[PDB]
Design an enzyme around this catalytic site. Structure first.
Site, PDB file in Angstrom:
ATOM      1  N   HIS A  41      -0.815  13.704  -2.314  1.00  8.79           N
ATOM      2  CA  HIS A  41       0.158  13.419  -3.183  1.00  8.79           C
ATOM      3  C   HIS A  41       0.402  14.607  -4.263  1.00  8.79           C
ATOM      4  O   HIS A  41       1.102  14.551  -4.960  1.00  8.79           O
ATOM      5  CB  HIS A  41       0.254  11.987  -3.836  1.00  8.79           C
ATOM      6  CG  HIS A  41      -0.995  11.877  -4.954  1.00  8.79           C
ATOM      7  ND1 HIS A  41      -0.906  12.537  -6.022  1.00  8.79           N
ATOM      8  CD2 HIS A  41      -2.213  11.053  -4.938  1.00  8.79           C
ATOM      9  CE1 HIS A  41      -1.910  12.249  -6.793  1.00  8.79           C
ATOM     10  NE2 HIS A  41      -2.633  11.239  -6.047  1.00  8.79           N
ATOM     11  N   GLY A 137      -4.739  12.776 -14.537  1.00  8.15           N
ATOM     12  CA  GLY A 137      -5.291  14.274 -14.012  1.00  8.15           C
ATOM     13  C   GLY A 137      -6.706  14.138 -13.266  1.00  8.15           C
ATOM     14  O   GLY A 137      -7.293  15.085 -12.727  1.00  8.15           O
ATOM     15  N   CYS A 139      -7.103  12.567 -10.513  1.00  8.54           N
ATOM     16  CA  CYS A 139      -6.992  12.598  -8.958  1.00  8.54           C
ATOM     17  C   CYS A 139      -7.800  13.811  -8.379  1.00  8.54           C
ATOM     18  O   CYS A 139      -7.684  14.781  -8.664  1.00  8.54           O
ATOM     19  CB  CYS A 139      -5.625  12.469  -8.584  1.00  8.54           C
ATOM     20  SG  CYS A 139      -4.597  10.935  -9.447  1.00  8.54           S
TER      21      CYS A 139
HETATM   22  N1  LIG Z   1      -0.603   1.087 -12.391  1.00 11.58           N
HETATM   23  C1  LIG Z   1      -0.618   2.082 -12.942  1.00 11.58           C
HETATM   24  C2  LIG Z   1      -0.729   3.492 -13.367  1.00 11.58           C
HETATM   25  C3  LIG Z   1      -0.598   4.664 -12.424  1.00 11.58           C
HETATM   26  S1  LIG Z   1       0.958   5.505 -12.202  1.00 11.58           S
HETATM   27  O1  LIG Z   1       1.803   4.476 -11.907  1.00 11.58           O
HETATM   28  O2  LIG Z   1       1.113   6.469 -13.179  1.00 11.58           O
HETATM   29  N2  LIG Z   1       0.731   6.316 -10.858  1.00 11.58           N
HETATM   30  C4  LIG Z   1       1.322   5.922  -9.630  1.00 11.58           C
HETATM   31  C5  LIG Z   1       0.836   6.654  -8.308  1.00 11.58           C
HETATM   32  C6  LIG Z   1       0.980   6.015  -7.239  1.00 11.58           C
HETATM   33  C7  LIG Z   1       0.301   6.458  -5.922  1.00 11.58           C
HETATM   34  C8  LIG Z   1      -0.676   7.387  -6.229  1.00 11.58           C
HETATM   35 CL1  LIG Z   1      -1.370   7.733  -4.704  1.00 11.58          CL
HETATM   36  C9  LIG Z   1      -0.974   7.993  -7.283  1.00 11.58           C
HETATM   37  C10 LIG Z   1      -0.236   7.593  -8.431  1.00 11.58           C
HETATM   38  C11 LIG Z   1      -0.677   7.969  -9.879  1.00 11.58           C
HETATM   39  C12 LIG Z   1      -2.005   7.377 -10.282  1.00 11.58           C
HETATM   40  O3  LIG Z   1      -2.284   6.209 -10.009  1.00 11.58           O
HETATM   41  N3  LIG Z   1      -2.586   8.347 -11.081  1.00 11.58           N
HETATM   42  C13 LIG Z   1      -3.899   8.007 -11.887  1.00 11.58           C
HETATM   43  C14 LIG Z   1      -5.150   7.723 -11.297  1.00 11.58           C
HETATM   44  N4  LIG Z   1      -6.157   7.234 -11.901  1.00 11.58           N
HETATM   45  C15 LIG Z   1      -6.152   7.332 -13.330  1.00 11.58           C
HETATM   46  C16 LIG Z   1      -4.711   6.881 -14.017  1.00 11.58           C
HETATM   47  C17 LIG Z   1      -4.652   6.662 -15.166  1.00 11.58           C
HETATM   48  C18 LIG Z   1      -3.536   6.762 -15.868  1.00 11.58           C
HETATM   49  C19 LIG Z   1      -2.522   7.130 -15.120  1.00 11.58           C
HETATM   50  C20 LIG Z   1      -2.436   7.468 -14.093  1.00 11.58           C
HETATM   51  C21 LIG Z   1      -3.548   7.532 -13.385  1.00 11.58           C
HETATM   52  C22 LIG Z   1       0.531   7.789 -10.876  1.00 11.58           C
HETATM   53  C23 LIG Z   1      -0.084   3.796 -14.784  1.00 11.58           C
HETATM   54  C24 LIG Z   1      -1.635   3.607 -14.559  1.00 11.58           C
END
Ligand SMILES: N#CC1(CS(=O)(=O)N2Cc3ccc(Cl)cc3[C@H](C(=O)Nc3cncc4ccccc34)C2)CC1
Ligand SMILES: N#CC1(CS(=O)(=O)N2Cc3ccc(Cl)cc3[C@H](C(=O)Nc3cncc4ccccc34)C2)CC1
Ligand SMILES: [Cl-]
Lengths: 299, 306
Positions: A41, A137, A139
């Site tokens: 991604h 950040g 990921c």
């Molecule tokens: N529900 C929820 C949330 C995630 S999101 O909608 O911003 N997001 C959708 C998404 C979809 C698919 C994939 Cl593969 C990655 C991702 C990304 C992801 O999860 N990143 C992260 C990962 N870890 C910790 C995070 C904390 C905070 C914000 C992002 C974070 C972006 C709001 C927390």
């Protein structure tokens, strides 16, 4: 004496963390030999083959410390992107890629911008999520275990679910759980308690001198599982009983005798008491973790 | 999201761990530049431990009596000196893996990571706090002496603890890296016991602010308190007194969540009175006191989940 949530020493993994940037997305990569592994991604209903074909090697900026690595090739394996670089990591440890099962534990080296921030221990939940601590950040941060001098990489972080729990893949890019790498409606299923791990932690409490919960009773595997199903505990199998054999021999408490103690704890609570400084039954220590921490194994 | 007991990455410290041997005793040493630091009790037998005269035991030793092993390499000892309860062994090789470092003495309530080691080899890493009674609730077996505690804010390692002993209650005692013990302890097997321990109030408040940042407010109430009335109540539950310094230190977390420090104190007073009633805060059924205000700001998001 003492019992802590202990992670493996992270140095061998710290020497592999890099920053990967493509377009406006910056995340972490794992640099092993001449390949950087990261969530696919970083190139973002996505069509990853269509998005990837439009990228050239120079679109991926890879930074290891204060050094820019040049990408000379790229390919996708499931949900993981593999970036071939011109330089082999001189700090590459002896390693394997392993897929773990729910209930197994591992250490997470949380990273931001290719720089390690912290290390913590966690378990793969029965619902395939992990209760991690990750911000935007993070990921590309990885989970691992160490066996002798070999790092077994088992997890790569991809996303956070709406309940605040986390989802990711093995290092071959296969997700743990029914998750997809796309911004869409996804939720963790109802979770359960890892029974074999709670029993291991009760044996750890006995080894450390906490015995108040022991009783004269025993149970059968069949009666124990009927009670455990009522309390959202995972079923206990004969394999779990066999695995707990060594701890049963060291403390003199048969596994089904410890199951009788666990049934009483589930039906009555702790009554103002604690076990190893906790008022909840802890399920993120495996039988192997208990034996390793109570024996001082080094890496 | 999430909140874990998080340790600093241990690599910079792993590259400093060595094995030190004197006679039949083997323990861990910290190799920084051309000096290896270790507990002075490596020169004692178990008999010596009741009333050891370290000056008399040390004068009978030469450089070649100390065996120092770094990985599969024997380092040569070219000098030795004692500073308080630590022995400093000069070696003929500077550690090429020496990180940027400082020696810092911490106060009770401060947290740090511990890299537990046996035979100069790292075994695991965990997070700890210096208890108000100057002990640490660690996880250490025999052979762990010389394992160190540290923080790595930026790329500089601040070494704050070196492990020396386990007290009869199962808790641990040690020194700073200048060999001064934390607490009224001696590196002697004498009847010494940990004093009555208390809960680190400022850290519990920091962790309640972490719970609010992560999206939980069930424990809040419509009340406030004076600092003195809070302390009168807190002492009854064996909580450490909260000082004006602690109130000032919690200022940033108060500004981020919009909850005044004395308003959070009122919430804590009510939690002490009522318990949690089947509920949890950040996955715990007890009030957690091993996260400082600084740890909460480092780990938590800068944006509150309102
Ligand atoms: N529900 C929820 C949330 C995630 S999101 O909608 O911003 N997001 C959708 C998404 C979809 C698919 C994939 Cl593969 C990655 C991702 C990304 C992801 O999860 N990143 C992260 C990962 N870890 C910790 C995070 C904390 C905070 C914000 C992002 C974070 C972006 C709001 C927390
Ligand atoms: N009470 C008690 C115990 C310690 S002892 O009596 O074996 N012991 C007295 C002593 C006194 C002063 C000094 Cl400076 C060092 C020491 C040594 C020390 O603590 N070593 C250790 C250190 N850490 C964790 C241990 C776990 C297990 C066994 C030793 C452990 C030796 C039995 C736990
Ligand atoms: Cl301090």
């Amino acid at each position: 004496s003492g019992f802590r949530k202990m992670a493996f020493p992270s140095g061998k993994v710290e020497g592999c963390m890099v920053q990967v940037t493509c377009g406006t997305t910056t995340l972490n990569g794992l640099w092993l030999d001449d390949v950087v592994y990261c969530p696919r991604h970083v190139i973002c209903n996505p069509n990853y083959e269509d998005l990837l074909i439009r990228k050239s090697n120079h679109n991926f900026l890879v930074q290891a410390g204060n050094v820019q690595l040049r990408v000379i090739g790229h390919s996708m394996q499931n949900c993981v992107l593999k970036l071939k670089v011109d330089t082999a990591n001189p700090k590459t440890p002896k390693y394997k890629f392993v897929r773990i099962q729910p209930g197994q534990t591992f250490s997470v080296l949380a990273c931001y911008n290719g720089s390690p921030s912290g290390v913590y221990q966690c378990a793969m939940r029965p619902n395939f999520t992990i209760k991690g601590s990750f911000l935007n950040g993070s990921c590309g941060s990885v989970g691992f275990n160490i066996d002798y001098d070999c790092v077994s990489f088992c997890y790569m972080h991809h996303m956070e679910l709406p309940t605040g729990v986390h989802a990711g893949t093995d290092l071959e890019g296969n997700f743990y759980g029914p998750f997809v790498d796309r911004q869409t409606a996804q939720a963790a299923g109802t979770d359960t308690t890892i029974t074999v791990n709670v029993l291991a932690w009760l044996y750890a409490a006995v080894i450390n001198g906490d015995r108040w919960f022991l009783n004269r009773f025993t149970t059968t595997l069949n009666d124990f599982n009927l009670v455990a199903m009522k309390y959202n505990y995972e079923p206990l199998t004969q394999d779990h009983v066999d695995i707990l054999g060594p701890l049963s021999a060291q403390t003199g408490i048969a596994v089904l005798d410890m199951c009788a103690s666990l049934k009483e704890l589930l039906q009555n609570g702790m009554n103002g008491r604690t076990i190893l400084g906790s008022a909840l039954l802890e399920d993120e220590f495996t039988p192997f973790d208990v034996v390793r921490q109570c024996s001082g194994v080094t890496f």
